[PDB]
RNA sequence: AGUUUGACUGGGGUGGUCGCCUCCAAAAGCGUAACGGAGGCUUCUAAAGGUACCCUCAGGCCGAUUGAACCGGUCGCA
């Protein structure tokens, strides 16, 4: 509930002013922050799948699950049964507290960030180091917004404090 | 010493075949031949059985660390 007040009390009263909606339901609202990482190396050494679960739980605070394969590709020794991914889907306040742990301490501990979305307004971040966080083989981060285009998504994105670029 | 030592077959022998399943030949009911054209079987599951409740693939595109694998979105009667 750190950026929650900053969004409803403060950030919302400015988005309607600029884009000029006739209501308050047209303004973008990120609804979840999905985190994921690929463990193709575990196809031959699967002891590093449990360790990923333990690490992917200390960061967000909520338990994660393995992701099972879905294809039959020999070039990755892949048959449709192996656990090769770990995902966590933060939502509501759980992503709100997590977001503040990242904009202030994660980007600061980097050794800023690209500006390119999928086109529907969902910025996704792949950081190649897991020790960028406090609790800690990178991991994907995706903020699924309620926006329509990149224009609406960007305004929600920069208001939070994402370092972005230019 | 008494006997046995298959049949089909564009002559016989050599080769191939011999029971069962699916398609075409088959002429819009059923059936229907060729040493006509194609493939399979001689199993499997203690759940891959029963029921209640629930769910939806393949592929392409855009985004994204190691990346046709993982995640987000969306076009998708399959
Ligand atoms: Mg006699
Ligand atoms: Mg004869
Ligand atoms: Mg008929
Ligand atoms: Mg007839």
DSSP string, A64-127: -EEEE----BTTTTB-TT-EEEEEEEE-THHHHHHHHHHHTTTGGG---------SSS--EEEE
Chain-centroid distance, C-alpha A72: 28
Q: Give the torsion through C-alpha atoms of A10, A15, A17, A20, to 10 deg.
A: -150
Q: What is the resolution of this structure in A?
A: 2.6
Contacts of residue A25, defined as CB under 8 A and 6 or more positions apart, other chains included, come to none
First-last CA distance in chain A: 29
Helices (H), chain A: 3-5, 12-19, 47-58, 93-103, 150-160
For residues A146 and A27, give the distance between their C-alpha atoms in angstroms, rounded to a whole number.
8
Q: Kindly list the protein residues whose beta carbon lies within 7 Å of any strand B atom.
A: A 34, 36-41, 43, 67-71, 73, 75-76, 78, 84-85, 87, 89, 114, 116-120, 122-128, 137-140, 142, 144
For residues A77 and A25, give the distance between their C-alpha atoms in angstroms, rounded to a whole number.
48
Instruction: Measure Cα distances from A132 to A114, A126, A129, A135, A155 in Å.
Output: 17, 12, 6, 9, 25
How close is the Cα of A126 to the center of ligand 1, in Å? 97
Q: Residue A133, Cβ neighbours under 10 Å: how many?
A: 19
Find the residue closest to B73 using CA and C1' atoms. A120
Q: Exposed (0-12), middle (13-18) or buried (19+): which is A156, by Cβ within 10 Å?
A: buried
Q: Residue A67, Cβ neighbours under 10 Å: how many?
A: 17
> Which nucleotides of chain B does any protein CB come within 7 A of?
58-59, 62-74
Q: What is the DSSP letter of A78?
A: B
Which residues share a beta bridge with A140?
A36, A126
For residues A62 and A88, is the Cβ–Cβ distance under 8 A? yes
CA–C1' span, A102 to B36, in Å? 75
Q: Residue A40, Cβ neighbours under 10 Å: how many?
A: 13
For residues A9 and A6, give the distance between their C-alpha atoms in angstroms, rounded to a whole number.
6
Name the structure determination technique: cryo-EM
């Amino acid at each position: 509930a750190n950026l929650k007040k900053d969004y409803q009390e403060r950030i919302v009263p400015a988005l309607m002013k600029q884009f000029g909606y006739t209501s308050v339901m047209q303004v973008p609202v990120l609804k979840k922050i999905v985190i994921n990482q690929g463990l193709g190396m575990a196809t031959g050494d699967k002891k590093i799948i449990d360790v990923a679960v333990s690490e992917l739980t200390a960061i967000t605070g909520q338990k994660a699950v393995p992701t099972v394969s879905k294809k039959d590709i020999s070039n990755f020794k892949l048959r449709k049964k192996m656990p090769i991914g770990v995902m966590v889907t933060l939502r509501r306040e759980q992503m709100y507290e997590f977001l503040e742990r990242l904009v202030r301490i994660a980007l600061p501990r980097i050794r800023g960030i690209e500006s390119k979305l999928d086109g529907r307004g969902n910025y996704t971040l792949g950081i190649n180091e897991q020790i960028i966080f406090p609790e800690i083989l990178g991991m994907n981060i995706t903020f699924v917004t309620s926006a329509q285009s990149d224009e609406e998504g960007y305004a929600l994105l920069k208001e939070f404090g994402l370092p972005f670029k230019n």
